[PDB]
């Protein structure tokens, strides 16, 4: 069948349990995949959407993407009206909820930066895959053991090979994570997620505080248009704010790639570590 998906398995084959909810995330449930007896997480659509195409679209994406910093698909059920999307069970839950419920004495500045590096590792892969997310945020990220974070909830992640207009009439995009061009012209690029990533970086560094806090929504576009961007969080290193300023660049052509951002974090990590701010192979032909 052209409708084939290798992750398609029987609903009976998994034993669902109690919901984890997710607050603003969606209908997430606990399950156990019988033949391995391992607890798993199952996200289904909330009825009132009735937009099967955008939620079910993630099922195809997670089969066609793989990275240690991306939510791995464990199964799906699109052969049956009770549509389910089944993945691994995330120990520390959603990242926004985790930072709200974290041990702040354990979760210091450098781990917040490292967890942003985990996300950058996921998003640079999406860049390689020419995939775009358009909903990149702590609420849409997951955390498990050893502060491992992975990008999740691939509902707004539409597959294009090089299309600028990834919207569809109703612009369902989080404004403070949406790029200047994406607000003004309603035109999107790989750089539109680079804005979302920088806003997420700030959100992590503030222990899950809300980005652009205390400003009216009615003022948000105005100030963003005036080149305004959030300043460095208390405890967030100088180097990280420079990285943020690049991610919050007005011009997408002057705004950096996720490859460049992935470089920027490992470049920063120089605590008893080799200063990897070097170029392509220091020898002779370093063009």
Swiss-Prot record:
<feature type="modified residue" description="Phosphotyrosine; by autocatalysis and SRC-type Tyr-kinases">
    <location>
        <position position="165"/>
    </location>
</feature>
<protein>
    <recommendedName>
        <fullName>Tyrosine-protein kinase ABL1</fullName>
    </recommendedName>
</protein>
<feature type="binding site">
    <location>
        <position position="43"/>
    </location>
    <ligand>
        <name>ATP</name>
    </ligand>
</feature>
<comment type="function">
    <text>Non-receptor tyrosine-protein kinase that plays a role in many key processes linked to cell growth and survival such as cytoskeleton remodeling in response to extracellular stimuli, cell motility and adhesion, receptor endocytosis, autophagy, DNA damage response and apoptosis. Coordinates actin remodeling through tyrosine phosphorylation of proteins controlling cytoskeleton dynamics like WASF3 (involved in branch formation); ANXA1 (involved in membrane anchoring); DBN1, DBNL, CTTN, RAPH1 and ENAH (involved in signaling); or MAPT and PXN (microtubule-binding proteins).</text>
</comment>
<feature type="domain" description="Protein kinase">
    <location>
        <begin position="14"/>
        <end position="265"/>
    </location>
</feature>
<feature type="active site" description="Proton acceptor">
    <location>
        <position position="135"/>
    </location>
</feature>
<feature type="binding site">
    <location>
        <begin position="20"/>
        <end position="28"/>
    </location>
    <ligand>
        <name>ATP</name>
    </ligand>
</feature>
<feature type="modified residue" description="Phosphotyrosine">
    <location>
        <position position="29"/>
    </location>
</feature>
<feature type="binding site">
    <location>
        <begin position="88"/>
        <end position="94"/>
    </location>
    <ligand>
        <name>ATP</name>
    </ligand>
</feature>
<feature type="modified residue" description="Phosphoserine">
    <location>
        <position position="218"/>
    </location>
</feature>
<comment type="subunit">
    <text>Interacts with SORBS1 following insulin stimulation. Found in a trimolecular complex containing CDK5 and CABLES1. Interacts with CABLES1 and PSTPIP1. Interacts with ZDHHC16, ITGB1 and HCK. Interacts with STX17; probably phosphorylates STX17. Interacts with INPPL1/SHIP2. Interacts with ABI1, ABI2, BCR, CRK, FGR, FYN, HCK, LYN, PSMA7 RAD9A, RAD51, RAD52, TP73 and WASF3.</text>
</comment>
<feature type="modified residue" description="Phosphotyrosine">
    <location>
        <position position="25"/>
    </location>
</feature>
<feature type="modified residue" description="Phosphotyrosine">
    <location>
        <position position="185"/>
    </location>
</feature>
<comment type="similarity">
    <text>Belongs to the protein kinase superfamily. Tyr protein kinase family. ABL subfamily.</text>
</comment>
<feature type="short sequence motif" description="Kinase activation loop">
    <location>
        <begin position="153"/>
        <end position="177"/>
    </location>
</feature>
<feature type="modified residue" description="Phosphoserine">
    <location>
        <position position="1"/>
    </location>
</feature>
